[PDB]
C-alpha cells in the first residue's frame, strides 16, 4: 500500500503475485489497469530493454542459481516485447479508459507508471531508476518467500499497523472539504467571466463547506460527505 | 549442481539452449540477437525434488551481533578457537523436520559457522 | 477394516496401506537432470549400465531409496508404468537393484528441447 | 418524437421496477433526495422484520 | 507446606524433563514417531510431560 | 492533544499550500497561502466574545474557531495588465477545536 | 490447541530469547492463583482466556 | 470482542515528523545513493529504508545503528519518536518517522547495568521544587521510546536487579529493561 504523504491522491497498492501452477510466472497488478501484466513487461516499460539489467535489479547475487531458474519462466514469457514502446502499448492497452489511438494508449501507460503505481518512491519526471529498484525489491522479496528463505508476513503483528488519531482523521476530511470549495469557486468564476463581467470571490467562497462538513461528520460519525454517508 | 542463466554477449539477453543438428552439439543462441556460443555443461535443467538445502550457505556471519540470540561457551570455534558462539535453529520456513542447531563464532573477523 | 490374516500382523497390514495410499513419482524421486547427451553410449556421466543396454536428450532421474522401499517398489514396475502411461514414444533404461544410485533414463524417439520438461512435469 | 419515447419508457421501466425491487444488481438504487435508498415492496417483506 | 514442597519438586522435575527432550532434539536423537514429523513428535513429548 | 495540535499547526497549512492554483477568454491565477486561526468566538445583534466551553455546552453551540487564509488573485488578459488583487484573511470556514488543546481558551 | 505461538520473530515475548521451547517460554503457567502469576504468564494466561 | 481495544498506561502514539534531517544526515555519512550505485554492490551491503523508501546502501551497519542510536539518545537530529530497526539476518535498516506508530518507554541497559542511577532518582524526587522532569530523563539518555517493530530486536529484562544479576546465564545481553 504505497502512499506519499497525505496527498490529495490516496493510497495505491501494487501486487507482485506469483501464479500457482512451465510454471512459476510472476505477474503484477498495477493500479488503474484492469488485467494484470507480467513483470518483465513492466521493467521494459520503465525502460530497461536488456535482460541482464532487469535482472540486476531483481537478483543481487548472480551467483546463486537457485533464484535464477525461478525467474526464467517469466523471462521467457515476455520475449515478444523488447523495446520500451511496444511495452507501453501492452500496459496502455488495458486501462479503464483505453485510448482509441495508440498514442493515447502510450500516454496512458506512461502516466500510470509515473503517478499511480509506487508514488512514495517518487512521482517526478525521472524516477524510473528508483521505481525500478523498489519494484525489483518487491519481486525479490516475493522470490524469497517462495524459495522458502524467509517467513511470510503476519497480518496481525502490530508493527504492521498504524493508528489514525484525531489528526489524520481530520486531515482526511479537510482535504475533501478543501477540494469542494475549489470546485465552488471554480463554477463561480465561470458563471461570471462568461458574462464578460468580472468575478468576485467573497461571494464565491462558500463557507458552509468546511464549517458544515466538519460539523457534520463529527456529529453523526460518518467519515465522509452527507451525500454518500451510507 | 545447477545451470545458471548465461546472458548474451551482444544484446545482453538470455541465451537459450539449442542442439546443433549438424555437428551434434549443444549451443546457446539468442532470440533478439544472432549469437551462438558453444556450451560446456551439457546439462540443461536440473531439479532437486528433495530440495536438499545446506543451511550453512545461508547463514551470514553478521548474526553474531544479535543481542537476542542465545550464546554458549561449550562449543568453541574451529578456525579461531573462541569460546563464545551463538546458536539458532534453521530459522527457515520449509524446515522439513529438523530442530538442528547452527553455531557462529562470536568473534569479529571470524564468522566461522558450523553444525553439530 | 482389514479382513483375514492382515488384520493381526502389522507387517501384512502395512502393504495394504501401501496398496491404498497415493504414490506418484514425486514422492520417490530426488533429482531430475535433463541433459543433451547425444551419443547414448557417450553418456556425459559415469554410468556403465547403458553400455550394457546398447534422440540426444535424456532425463536422468535419480530416485530415492528410503522412499522407494518404504513403499516397496521395484524399478520394473516403474519402468512398466513409465511406458504404459506414455506408450511406445519413449524408452526407459532403468538401473539395477544392486547399485547405490537409483537412476532412470528416458529418451524420446520416433520445440524438442522443452518437451522432456513438458513430460517430466 | 419516436425516439424520445424510448428514453421515456426506459425511465418508466426503471421506476416501476424499483418500486417493487429496490436492490437490482448493476442498477442505480432509487434514492430519496436526502440521499437514502427507498424501501420497495420487496423489502417490506424480504428478510427478518419483513 | 509439605504439599508445597511436593508440588515444587514435581514441577522442577517436569521442567527438567522437558530440557532433556530439547537436548535430544537439538542433537538429532529424538526420532520421529511413525505418523508425525519431528516438530510434532517433539511437541507431543513436551505436552505429555 | 498532540495529534490535534499537529493537525492544526502543520497539516492545515499543508493541505492548503499544495492545492493547485485555479485558472479559467483570458484567465486568472487565484493563489492561496498563509493561513491563520483565531480563538473560538461567538458573535464574531451581537458582539464577538469568546465562548467558553461550558457556555458552548449549555447553549448547544459548537466550540469552533474561524479560519482565515490570504488569497492573491491574479487575473491576467490581453495587453499584459495583471493585478494581484490580494484578499487578506478571507474567511474559509469554522474549524472545531478540541478541548484543552493549544488553541482552546 | 497448540502452545503459545511465536508472535514476535521466533519468540513469544521480547523477554525470552530466540528459539526457546521450554515450558516457561511457551505458556506453561506454573504458579497457582493463590501465589499469583508472573508478568509474562499473566499475559499468556490472558491470550488463552481470550 | 477483541476488535475494540484500549491503550496500555504508558503507550504513546507517535505523531509524526519529517524525514529530512535523517535523509540529510545519512547522506553525509558513508552512505551510497541509490542512483549512483553499481548493481553489483548490493550483495554484501545493507539496504537502508527511510519510511518505506529504499534510499541508499551502506557497507557498515554496526556504525549506523550505533550512531543513529547515540543520536536519538541526545535528542538532536533524530527526534525521540523515530525508530531504527536493524534486521541482521536480512541486510536491512529500516527507519520510520511517520505517524501512528504506537511506542512505549523502556529503561536502557548498557552492559548489565541500567543507566538510571541514583542521581536521577534524587533529582526527580526534587522536581516540582525546581524544574526537573521526565524530559530530562529522555534527553539525558536514560529511557527510550521503543516501539513494536523495533521491540522485536530488543532483549528485554523484566525487573532490573533480578534479571540482570548473575546465575547460570539466561542471556547476559539485555538491551532494555522495563519500568
Ligand atoms: Zn543476443
Ligand atoms: Zn571463531
Least Cα separation, residue E15 to chain G (angstroms): 7
Query: Is B30 annotated to bind ligand?
Result: yes
Show residues of chain G in contact with E43, CB under 8 Å: 2-3
Cα–Cα distance for residue pair A157/G6, rounded to 1 Å: 11
- Where in the sequence is the domain holding C83, given as residue range(s)? 10-121
Decide: C104 and C92 in contact? Cβ < 8 Å: yes
Quote the cell numbers at residue C16.
495394504
Chain A CB contacts of H151 below 8 Å: 159
Indicate whether B53 and B108 sit together in one domain.
yes
| Number of structural domains chain C divides into | 1
Residues whose CB is less than 8 angstroms from the CB of residue F23 and which lie 6 or more positions away in sequence, other chains included? F29, F30
Q: Which run of H or E residues covers position A106? A: helix A102-111
Touch criterion met for G and B (3+ Cβ pairs within 8 Å): yes
Closest residue on chain H to B59 (Cα): H89
Please indicate, yes or no, whether residues B39 and B55 belong to a single structural domain of this protein: no
F95 φ, ψ (degrees, to nearest 5): -120, 130
H-helix or E-strand spanning residue F27: strand F27-28
Q: How many beta carbons lie within 10 A of that of residue H96, not counting itself?
A: 24
User: In terms of domains, do B11 and B42 share one?
Assistant: yes
Unique residue bearing C-alpha cell 463581467: A197
CA distance H113 to H10: 23
**Interacting residues of B21 by C-beta distance below 8 A, sequence separation 6+:** none
A184 vs A177: CA distance, rounded Å: 11
Cβ pair F64, A211 in contact under 8 A: yes
Residue of B nearest to E40 (CA): B97
Cα separations in angstroms, F16 against A106, A178, A179, A214: 33, 8, 10, 16
> Is C1 domain-assigned?
no
Backbone φ and ψ of A171, nearest 5°:
-75, -15
Q: Which segments within chain C are labelled E, that is strand?
A: 29-35, 58-63, 103-104
Counting ligands in written order, the one closest to the CA of B86 is: 2
Q: Are A210 and F67 in contact (CB under 8 A)?
A: yes
Residues 6+ apart with CB under 8 A from C97: C74, C75
**Strand blocks (E) in B1-116:** 16-20, 25-29, 37-38, 45-48, 71-72, 85-88, 102-105, 113-114
Helix axes A128-146, A51-58, angle to 10 degrees: 70
Cβ separation G23–E43 shorter than 8 A: no
Residue of chain G whose Cα is closest to the Cα of B92: G10
Chain A residues with beta carbon closer than 8 angstroms to that of F3: 165-168
Which residues from H are below 8 Å from A168, CB to CB?
Answer: 99-100
Chain H residue numbers touching G8 (CB-CB < 8 A): 151-152
Distance CA A42, CA A54 (A): 10
Distance from the alpha carbon of residue A80 to the mean position of ligand 1, in angstroms? 14
Does some domain include residue C77?
Answer: yes
Q: Indicate the SS3 state at residue C84.
A: helix
Residue B41 belongs to domain spanning? 1-47
Residues of B contacting chain H (CB within 8 angstroms): 60, 62-63, 65-68, 70-71, 91
Q: Does B80 touch chain E (CB under 8 A)?
A: no
Cβ atoms of F92 and A207 within 8 Å: the answer is yes
Yes or no, beta carbons of E37 and B97 under 8 Å apart: yes
Asked if B11 and A75 come within 8 Å (Cβ–Cβ), the reply is: no
Q: Which of B99, B101, B116 to mutate to test the interface with E (most CBs of E within 10 A)?
A: B99
Is C115 within a domain? yes
The CATH number of residue C65's host domain is 3.30.1360.140
Take residue A93 and report the three cell numbers written for it: 492497452
With an 8 Å Cβ cutoff, are B63 and H89 in contact?
yes
- Which residues lie below 8 Å from residue B79, measured CB to CB, with a gap of 6+? B105, B110, B112
Query: In G, which residues are within 8 Å of E22 by CB distance?
Result: 21-22
**Which residues make up the environment of ion ligand 1, defined by Cβ < 5 Å?**
B 8, 10-11, 13, 30, 33, 35
Minimal-distance CA residue of chain H relative to B88: H89
Contact H102 A56 (CB under 8 A): no
- C39 inside domain: yes
**Structural domain contains residue C26:** yes
Are residue B41 and residue B1 in the same domain, yes or no? yes
Q: If we measure between CA atoms, which residue out of G7, H152, E22 comes closest to residue B101?
A: E22
- Looking at the fold, whether B23 and B2 belong to one and the same domain comes out as yes
**Quick one: which of B77, B84, B73 has its CA closest to B114?**
B77
B28 CA from centroid of ligand 1 (Å): 10
Residues B115 and B97 reside in one and the same domain: yes
Elucidated via? cryo-EM
- Range 1-49 of E in CB contact (< 8 A) with G: 11, 14-15, 18-19, 22, 42-43, 46-47
Neighbours of H95 (CB within 10 A): 23
Nearest-by-CA chain H residue for A126? H35
- Tell me if C56 is assigned to some domain: yes
Residue B107 CA to ligand 2 centre (angstroms)? 6
**Number of C-beta neighbours around residue B6 at 10 A:** 16
- Look at the block and give the residue holding cell 560446456: B40
For G17, the closest of B69, B89, B91 (CB atoms) is B69
Nearby residues of D24 by Cβ (< 8 Å), 6 or more positions away:
D17, D18
Based on the domain organization, do B30 and B54 belong to the same domain?
A: no
Gap between the Cα atoms of A150 and A138, Å rounded: 13
Ligand number nearest CA of B31 is 1
Q: Would C4 be classed as within a structural domain?
A: no
Q: Tell me, what DSSP letter sits at residue A18?
A: B
Instruction: Look at chain B and report how many structural domains it folds into.
Output: 2
Phi, psi (rounded to 5 degrees) for E17:
-65, -40
F6 grid coordinates: 499537529
Residue C97, number of CB atoms within 10 A of its CB: 10
Residue C83 placed within a domain:
yes
Distance from CA of D33 to the nearest CA of A (A): 9
> Which helix (H) or strand (E) element contains residue H105?
strand H102-108
The helix/strand/coil state of B5 is coil
Side-chain-side CA neighbours of C58 within 13 Å: the count stands at 25
Q: Is B8 annotated as a binding residue?
A: yes
CA distance F31 to A207: 18
CA angle C66, C68, C70 (to 5 degrees): 65
Amino acid at each position: 500500500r504505497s502512499c506519499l504523504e497525505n496527498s490529495s491522491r490516496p493510497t495505491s497498492t501494487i501486487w507482485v503475485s506469483m501464479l500457482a501452477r512451465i510454471g512459476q510466472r510472476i505477474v503484477a497488478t498495477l493500479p488503474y489497469i484492469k488485467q494484470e501484466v507480467p513483470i518483465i513487461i513492466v521493467f521494459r516499460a520503465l525502460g530497461f530493454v536488456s535482460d541482464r539489467d532487469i535482472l540486476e535489479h531483481i537478483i543481487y547475487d548472480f551467483e546463486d542459481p537457485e533464484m535464477m531458474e525461478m525467474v526464467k519462466p517469466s523471462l521467457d514469457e515476455a520475449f515478444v516485447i523488447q523495446e520500451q514502446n511496444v511495452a507501453l502499448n501492452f500496459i496502455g492497452s488495458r486501462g479503464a479508459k483505453p485510448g482509441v489511438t495508440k498514442e493515447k494508449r502510450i500516454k496512458y501507460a506512461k502516466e500510470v507508471l509515473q503517478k499511480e503505481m509506487l508514488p512514495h518512491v517518487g512521482v517526478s519526471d525521472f524516477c524510473e531508476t528508483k521505481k525500478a529498484y523498489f519494484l525489483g525489491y518487491m519481486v525479490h522479496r516475493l522470490l524469497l518467500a517462495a524459495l522458502g528463505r524467509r517467513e511470510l508476513d503476519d497480518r496481525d503483528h502490530y508493527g504492521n499497523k498504524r493508528l489514525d488519531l484525531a489528526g489524520p482523521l481530520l486531515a482526511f476530511l479537510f482535504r475533501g472539504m478543501f477540494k469542494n470549495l475549489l470546485k465552488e469557486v471554480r463554477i463561480y468564476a465561470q458563471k461570471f467571466i462568461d458574462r464578460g463581467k468580472d468575478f468576485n470571490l467573497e461571494l464565491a467562497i462558500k463557507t458552509r463547506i468546511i464549517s458544515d462538513g466538519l460539523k457534520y461528520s463529527l456529529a453523526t460519525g460518518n467519515w465522509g460527505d452527507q451525500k454518500k454517508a451510507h | 549442481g545447477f545451470v545458471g542463466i548465461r546472458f548474451c554477449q551482444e544484446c545482453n539477453n538470455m541465451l537459450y539452449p539449442k542442439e546443433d543438428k549438424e555437428n551434434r552439439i549443444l549451443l546457446y543462441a539468442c532470440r533478439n540477437c544472432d549469437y551462438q556460443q558453444e556450451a560446456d555443461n551439457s546439462c540443461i535443467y536440473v531439479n532437486k525434488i528433495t530440495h536438499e538445502v545446506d543451511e550453512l550457505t545461508q547463514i551470514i556471519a553478521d548474526v553474531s551481533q544479535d543481542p537476542t540470540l542465545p550464546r554458549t561457551e561449550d562449543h568453541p570455534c574451529q578456525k579461531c578457537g573462541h569460546k563464545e558462539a551463538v546458536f539458532f535453529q534453521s530459522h527457515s520456513a520449509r524446515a522439513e523436520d529438523a530442530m538442528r542447531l547452527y553455531y557462529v563464532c562470536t568473534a569479529p573477523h571470524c564468522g566461522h559457522r558450523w553444525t553439530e | 477394516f482389514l479382513l483375514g490374516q492382515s488384520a493381526r500382523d502389522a507387517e501384512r497390514a502395512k502393504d495394504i496401506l501401501c496398496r491404498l495410499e497415493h504414490t506418484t513419482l514425486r514422492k520417490v524421486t530426488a533429482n531430475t537432470a535433463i541433459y543433451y547427451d547425444p551419443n547414448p553410449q557417450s553418456t556425459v556421466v559415469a554410468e556403465d549400465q547403458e553400455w550394457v543396454n546398447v534422440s540426444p536428450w535424456l532425463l536422468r532421474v535419480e530416485l530415492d531409496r528410503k522412499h522407494m522401499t518404504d513403499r516397496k517398489l521395484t524399478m520394473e514396475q516403474i519402468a512398466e508404468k513409465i511406458n504404459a502411461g506414455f506408450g511406445d514414444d519413449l524408452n526407459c533404461i532403468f538401473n539395477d537393484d544392486n547399485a547405490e544410485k537409483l537412476v532412470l533414463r528416458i529418451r524420446i524417439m520416433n520445440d524438442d528441447d522443452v518437451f522432456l520438461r513438458c513430460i517430466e512435469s | 418524437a419516436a425516439h424520445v419515447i424510448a428514453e421515456d419508457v426506459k425511465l418508466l421501466q426503471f421506476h416501476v421496477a424499483t418500486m417493487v425491487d429496490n436492490e437490482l444488481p448493476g442498477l442505480p438504487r432509487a434514492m430519496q433526495k436526502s440521499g437514502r435508498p427507498l424501501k420497495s415492496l420487496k423489502q417490506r417483506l424480504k428478510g427478518k422484520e419483513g | 507446606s509439605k504439599t508445597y514442597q511436593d508440588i515444587q519438586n514435581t514441577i522442577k522435575k517436569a521442567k527438567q524433563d522437558v530440557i532433556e527432550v530439547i537436548e535430544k532434539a537439538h542433537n538429532n536423537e529424538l526420532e520421529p514417531t511413525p505418523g508425525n514429523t519431528l516438530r510434532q513428535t517433539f511437541e507431543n513429548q513436551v505436552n505429555r510431560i | 492533544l498532540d495529534s490535534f495540535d499537529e493537525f492544526i499547526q502543520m497539516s492545515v497549512q499543508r493541505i492548503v499550500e499544495d492545492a493547485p492554483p485555479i485558472d479559467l477568454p483570458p484567465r486568472y491565477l487565484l493563489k492561496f497561502e498563509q493561513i491563520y486561526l483565531s480563538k473560538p468566538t461567538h458573535w464574531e445583534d451581537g458582539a464577538p466574545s469568546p465562548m467558553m466551553p461550558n457556555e458552548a455546552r449549555l447553549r448547544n453551540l459548537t466550540y469552533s474557531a474561524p479560519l482565515y487564509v490570504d488569497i492573491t488573485k491574479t487575473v491576467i488578459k490581453e495587453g499584459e495588465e495583471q493585478l494581484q488583487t490580494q484578499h487578506q484573511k478571507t474567511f474559509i470556514g469554522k474549524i472545531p477545536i478540541m478541548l484543552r488543546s493549544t488553541y482552546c481558551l | 490447541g497448540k502452545r503459545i505461538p511465536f508472535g514476535f520473530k521466533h519468540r513469544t515475548l521480547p523477554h525470552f530469547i530466540k528459539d526457546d521451547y521450554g515450558p516457561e517460554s511457551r505458556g506453561f503457567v506454573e504458579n497457582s492463583y493463590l501465589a499469583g502469576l508472573t508478568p509474562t504468564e499473566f499475559f499468556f494466561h490472558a491470550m488463552g482466556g481470550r | 470482542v477483541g476488535l475494540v481495544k484500549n491503550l496500555a498506561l504508558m503507550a504513546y502514539i507517535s505523531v509524526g515528523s519529517q524525514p529530512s534531517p535523517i535523509l540529510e544526515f545519512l547522506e553525509e555519512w558513508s552512505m551510497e545513493n541509490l542512483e549512483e550505485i553499481s548493481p553489483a554492490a548490493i550483495a554484501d551491503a545493507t539496504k537502508i529504508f527511510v519510511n518505506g523508501c529504499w534510499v541508499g546502501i551502506h557497507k557498515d551497519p554496526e556504525q549506523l545503528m550505533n550512531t543513529l542510536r547515540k543520536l536519538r539518545r541526545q535528542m538532536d537530529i533524530i527526534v525521540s519518536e523515530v525508530s531504527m530497526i536493524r534486521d541482521i539476518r536480512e541486510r536491512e535498516i529500516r527507519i520510520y518517522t511517520d505517524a501512528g506508530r504506537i511506542c512505549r518507554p523502556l529503561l536502557i541497559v548498557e552492559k548489565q547495568k541500567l543507566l538510571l542511577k541514583k542521581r536521577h532518582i534524587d533529582q526527580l524526587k526534587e522536581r516540582e521544587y525546581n524544574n526537573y522532569s521526565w524530559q530530562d530523563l529522555v534527553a539525558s539518555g536514560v529511557v527510550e521510546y521503543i516501539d513494536t517493530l523495533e521491540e522485536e530486536t530488543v532483549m528485554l529484562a523484566m525487573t532490573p536487579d533480578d534479571l540482570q544479576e548473575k546465575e547460570v546465564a539466561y542471556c547476559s545481553t539485555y538491551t532494555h529493561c522495563e519500568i
